[PDB]
Design a protein around this nucleic acid. Structure first.
Lengths: 99, 79, 207, 60, 63
RNA sequence: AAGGAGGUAAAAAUGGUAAAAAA
RNA sequence: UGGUUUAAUUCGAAGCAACGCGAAGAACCUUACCAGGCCUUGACAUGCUAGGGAACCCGGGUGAAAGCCUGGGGUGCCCCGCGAGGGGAGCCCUAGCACAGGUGCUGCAUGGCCGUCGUCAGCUCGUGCCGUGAGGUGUUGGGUUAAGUCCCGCAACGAGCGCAACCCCCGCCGUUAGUUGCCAGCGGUUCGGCCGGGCACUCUAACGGGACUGCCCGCGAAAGCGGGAGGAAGGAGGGGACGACGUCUGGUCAGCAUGGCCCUUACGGCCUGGGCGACACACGUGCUACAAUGCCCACUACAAAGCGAUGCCACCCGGCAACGGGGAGCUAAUCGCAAAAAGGUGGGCCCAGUUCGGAUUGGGGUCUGCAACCCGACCCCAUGAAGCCGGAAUCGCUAGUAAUCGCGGAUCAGCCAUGC
């Protein structure tokens, strides 16, 4: 019944936040449907290499937003307690809901 | 284009409707040219700006509800 | 011609972002705005002891700054009466919860920003360009580095022709990655012009 | 003019249609990628100098 | 799913190949010399900044 | 032929750019 | 874009390396250009002298607008007060001052940043040897490669930045994982993944393995080449970022900083207008075309990627439409942009300045926006030019490349986007 989405720019750590949760949650309760990866939406940007009227000569840059999704079963007090308390995203965005 | 209505401005309005309180002097001195020509201006010496100076244009009928600053050349020099 | 920031290419596993915080699509702007302002007024003040990196974190009031200084000593002040005013103003123009953290790097002659800092500042104090700067590359490879290069471009001594005097010692494999390079450019200002000081320093493989 | 121009829009005048974006890390309106509130040269100087999250020296 | 009518066709071929080369890999012996497993290539390549169809370039002046 | 070489061959429609001066 | 011209048609860039280039959204804004109105301790910050106002909420005249002369309110706080008062601070006003400011010149004073030769294969270090020495050597010699790539020679042996490799996209497999997908396997059904169920398959997006001439045979002294297979993958698998030492006083002071020279109630600042879109020609990149492998109307098809909260906007409705009124869901793999188009499947045109091509043309409509004249996109219906496939010349492109066809995003009120 739990809808936890994790939006991330560093896919390395962002995934590390995806399985971690699942351990202690599969631990402090019952099943926790696997972290399931979700379409890393990417915002395409680009511009030219310099300042002066140089139509060619360009560099592309884009935003890598990886989506994560954890579903847990019927929650428990330990689970909810620690796994709403402890964290260290240091940036990464954590948004949950009751669907 | 105003789809429902016709764009004009109130400078001209207040002006025309006050000389109409009598029918006085044969001059007006407007700075707006974006405005739509109206028939209640009668149509004497609507002195409009151009880009360099005010240049009086005559107005009667066939300029009905089409824009003012169109009978003020601006684009000087010809070919 | 270019060279491109090794940095702006090392963002794989060789250069982790200076600012680490996720953002909303709308939000992005104002966030980075205040951010760059932080670094900004920080720059003018907390230069005094070599301001290299400026680690940034933001979660939601989590305004954690890990100011990589050079030597936080005569900069934290006695009892922290200087860390005080800075965190103060930090709060003054940040509508959230501020942090200081003076994480200077153990060793001086590493991380090229402060290298080039002292470098350009020697010319800022008029000093011998080639002599003391060759002494700088020297000092780098005298610290235990693997490759030091200092390009210095601009109006040396005036004389119209703005040369690009260059020195080096040790390998500088700029097309590589694992090797890892640190880049730092100081913005040298002659009383009579603006010359650009720039430095690359090499470290090693495997990492 | 320049200095006065940034101030012109910095204070929103009369009509909605007289605002124009502004590179607050360089100071212009041309090609200011509004998403960042940054011009294109300001954009590249930021992303390059490592002072911009979420990006990537893209290689797709 | 995907590609085009013909692309569909391609993937269909690919699979009809792979399926009989499972429940009887005896059919594999006489199907690679026939070339019924080499997948594909083809991509309307990443458009080159400066050129059109990543190859197609603008008319050169010189003058 | 691999080379160096001693004698006899082929090979250029056009032009003026100054200069005190930097490392 | 030259030229041309005007009051102004604002500058920049110039053989390749400028010409759909700064410009990735110039109606006024923008805006640096002009005519005019006007402010000027200045739209911006910085501090002092002596004075007054508390900040600050509203309004009237005037005018094109900025600007300008006044009117209603107004009296938060420190010290000393059941009393009178002043001084002090954010706080605005005026003189004076120190000043700001100037997209004015100077890229031949500069940084930085791109160009470009050019992914061209080039620039050198170390000990030794040759040369009085500058220095040469290594790097000149042959086969070979995309390659100073490798082999052979060899007075050298090697070593670093370059090439490559470590990085990403794309092709084969795997393990984690299952609100995308599905009877693939079961139940039912409003038979439409629609209702339960399930992770098999797509997919998603992560962590690796997989290809090295490794195997087989013939040639070459080897470097390599021929032939064949194992395999999704052959001999660098396709692509991308990647661009040295250096030149060129390239380009840029109008993105930025910037040494200097420079105007300082004017080269500063606001406003409203006008130009940046002008026209006797010329030029580069471009869209469309001039037609039956075609134009037209009807039915069905398969896209991939990128978007969307004060935005995406399916739906009925009014309108032939432009779009407007009521209206669902949507911080998105679940909602909508959105119909891909060519393909295919029917019927029309019958070779014609044609149902070709719409260039231009008039009487009306929709939308944004204060405002659509100069100078907006879009709708209607009536107009329907040149164009019969282009001489000298000259451009693109070696594989899913060219040619053809549709689709999105950037910035943007709108849109001149046939551009990128």
């Amino acid at each position: 019944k739990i809808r936890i989405k994790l939006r991330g720019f560093d896919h390395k750590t962002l995934d590390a936040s995806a399985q971690k949760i699942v351990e202690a949650a599969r631990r402090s309760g019952a099943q926790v449907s696997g972290p399931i990866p979700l379409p890393t939406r990417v915002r395409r940007f680009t511009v030219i290499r310099g300042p002066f009227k140089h139509k060619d000569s360009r560099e592309h840059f884009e935003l890598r937003t990886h989506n994560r999704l954890v579903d847990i079963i019927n929650p428990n007090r330990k689970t909810i307690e620690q796994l709403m308390t402890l964290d260290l995203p240091t940036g990464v965005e954590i948004e949950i809901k009751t669907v | 284009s105003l789809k429902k209505g016709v764009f004009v401005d109130d400078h001209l309005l207040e002006k025309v409707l006050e000389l109409n309180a009598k029918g006085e002097k044969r001059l007006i001195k407007t700075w707006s040219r974006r405005s739509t020509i109206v028939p209640e201006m009668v149509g004497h010496t609507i002195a409009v700006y151009n880009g360099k100076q005010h240049v009086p244009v005559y107005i009667t009928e066939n300029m009905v509800g089409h824009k003012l600053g169109e009978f003020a050349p601006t684009r000087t020099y010809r070919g | 011609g270019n060279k491109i920031h090794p940095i702006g290419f090392r963002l794989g596993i060789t250069r982790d972002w200076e600012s680490r915080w996720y953002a909303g699509k709308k939000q992005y702007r104002h966030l980075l705005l205040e951010d760059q302002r932080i670094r900004g007024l920080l720059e003018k003040e907390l230069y005094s002891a070599g301001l290299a990196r400026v680690d940034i974190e933001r979660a939601a009031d989590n305004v954690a700054v890990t100011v990589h200084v050079a030597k936080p000593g005569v900069v934290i002040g006695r009892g922290g009466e200087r860390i005080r005013v800075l965190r103060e103003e930090l709060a003054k123009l940040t509508g959230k919860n501020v942090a200081l953290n003076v994480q200077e790097v153990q060793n001086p002659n590493l991380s090229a920003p402060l290298v080039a800092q002292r470098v350009a500042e020697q010319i800022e104090r008029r000093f011998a360009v080639r002599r003391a700067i060759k002494q700088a590359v020297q000092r780098v490879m005298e610290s235990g580095a693997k490759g030091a290069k200092v390009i210095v471009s601009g109006r040396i001594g005036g004389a119209e022709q703005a040369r690009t005097e260059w020195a080096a010692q040790g390998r500088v494999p700029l097309h590589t990655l694992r090797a890892n390079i640190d880049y730092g450019f100081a913005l040298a200002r002659t009383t009579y012009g603006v010359l650009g000081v720039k430095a690359y320093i090499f470290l090693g493989e495997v990492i | 003019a320049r200095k006065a121009l940034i101030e012109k829009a910095k204070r929103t005048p009369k009509f909605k249609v007289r605002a124009y974006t502004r590179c607050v890390r360089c100071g212009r309106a041309r090609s200011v990628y509004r998403f960042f509130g940054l011009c294109r040269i300001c954009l590249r100087e930021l992303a390059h100098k490592g002072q911009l999250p979420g990006v990537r020296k893209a290689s797709w | 799913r995907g590609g085009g009518k013909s692309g569909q066709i391609d993937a269909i071929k690919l699979g009809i190949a792979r399926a009989l080369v499972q429940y009887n890999p005896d059919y594999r012996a006489k199907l690679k010399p026939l070339g019924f497993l080499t997948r594909d290539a083809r991509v309307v390549e990443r458009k080159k900044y400066g050129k059109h169809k990543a190859r197609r370039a603008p008319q050169y002046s010189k003058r």
